[PDB]
């Protein structure tokens, strides 16, 4: 019979409390585990996978053609092709990807990103593109030589078929990735003068998430 006193917090049911409960079936041993391949341990393993961005989310577009950036040959040079934001936790192209759906369950995110382009076109067709990152605080560039002074990659179709642009650091006014026709879309005869670009996006090892919250897609 030890003396004891009851302090405030007695007889309350805290939702997030880490307290043990009395088992209904004692001595019941469950079925032993077997080796099932593909076990996940954290959600950061789900953010580091490339995922097709829906950059063509405008109207007058069907179901699948929202995932493709069209490029044509009747398309003069030193001119813009596409542009999209970088912030994953926001309505836009980053809503169809997996890092955007995961970073909506959490209220804060930080770290670098990675945007990978892939050119679905003919083998005989070549040409260059200018992929340009503009950091937060700056508006979308209006000229190609203004974007060439920011962060840029000259990605051609002949040698490479898939370029990758790493987004240095984004906090939770977001930064703009533009994609410019630079030289042309030159094509030999008997070959279609219209191809597509699939844009994908994922996080990096620096990407960290914190302060949970129920999502709002439902």
């Amino acid at each position: 019979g030890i003396p004891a006193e009851l302090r405030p917090g007695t007889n309350q049911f805290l939702t997030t409390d880490d307290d043990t409960a009395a088992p209904i079936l004692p001595g019941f041993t469950p079925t032993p585990t077997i080796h099932i391949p593909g076990e996940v341990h954290s959600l950061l393993e789900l953010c580091r996978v490339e995922t097709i961005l829906e950059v063509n989310n405008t109207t007058e577009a069907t179901g699948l053609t929202r995932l493709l950036i069209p490029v044509s040959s009747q398309n003069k040079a030193d001119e813009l092709c596409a542009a999209f934001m970088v912030d994953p936790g926001r309505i836009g192209p980053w809503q169809s990807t997996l890092v955007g759906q995961i970073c909506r369950y959490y209220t804060q995110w930080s770290g670098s990103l990675k945007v990978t382009f892939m050119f679905t076109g003919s083998f005989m067709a070549t040409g260059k593109m200018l992929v340009a990152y503009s950091p937060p605080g700056s508006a979308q560039p209006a000229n190609r030589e203004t974007a060439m002074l920011g962060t840029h990659v000259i990605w051609d179709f002949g040698l490479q078929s898939s370029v990758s642009l790493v987004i240095p650091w984004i906090s939770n006014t977001a930064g703009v990735v533009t994609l410019w026709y630079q030289t042309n879309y030159v094509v030999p005869p008997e070959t279609p003068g219209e191809a597509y670009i699939i844009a994908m996006g994922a996080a990096q090892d620096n990407f960290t998430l914190k302060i949970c919250k129920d999502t709002d897609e439902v």
């Binding site: 939702t15 009395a22 209904i24 079925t31 099932i36 593909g38 959600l43 929202r66 596409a82 309505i91």
Partner: protein, 205 residues
């Protein structure tokens, strides 16, 4: 880097089911355990193909107006395979193998723990094939212990918490709205796009 683990992603209490009691005029109230009930935990458990976890069940029973009078209550856990109770004074309540909890309304809410009770090695909700009646998880009956019949209508809230949860074979997150409870039926017409529309492709809306 600790708020992103699957265990922390799933381990948190939260409403899992509302049970209405009347004690007129059925007397008792049953409830089949299923975590696919609400559309908030269904979307988090349809992200993974296989899951394995223990459960903590909390019973918060209130009255119609809100006042709590000291009446005895019996909660009864029916394991998978045992028959459900059919009446308020049936013989399924006195069965010794159905674990019961006797608690008053003025007492703190009831709290029990249920282990992994599936004959396989892990739960699964996406079963591609034909028999998924494999993971029943039990049932939870509740009645008012009394010789005669009482004249109160109660309202129980079952809050479920998951513990020691393990996940296997992740799968993408469902974007289409729900139509049924046990089937992933979407609508062929009016397919909702996964990204809100903007004006042009050359802008930053």
């Amino acid at each position: 880097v600790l708020e992103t683990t699957i265990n922390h992603f799933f381990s948190r209490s939260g409403l899992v089911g509302v049970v209405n009691l009347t004690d007129g005029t059925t007397g008792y109230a049953t409830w089949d355990i299923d975590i696919m009930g609400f559309v908030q935990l269904r979307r988090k458990c349809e992200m993974f193909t296989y899951m394995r976890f223990n459960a903590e069940f909390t019973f918060v029973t209130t009255t119609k107006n809100g006042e709590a009078r000291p009446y005895m209550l019996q909660y009864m856990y029916v394991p998978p395979g045992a028959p459900k109770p059919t009446g308020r004074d049936a013989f399924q309540w006195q069965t010794a193998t159905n674990p019961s909890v006797f608690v008053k309304l003025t007492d703190p809410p009831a709290q029990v723990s249920v282990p992994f009770m599936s004959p396989a090695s892990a739960y699964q909700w996406f079963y591609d094939g034909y028999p998924c009646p494999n993971n029943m998880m039990g049932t939870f009956a509740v009645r008012v212990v009394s010789r005669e019949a009482s004249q109160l209508k109660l309202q129980t809230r079952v809050y479920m918490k998951l513990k020691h949860v393990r996940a296997w074979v992740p799968r993408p997150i469902r974007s289409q709205p729900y139509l049924l409870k046990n089937f992933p039926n979407y609508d062929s017409s009016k397919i909702t796009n996964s990204a809100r529309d903007r004006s042009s492709i050359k802008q930053a809306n």
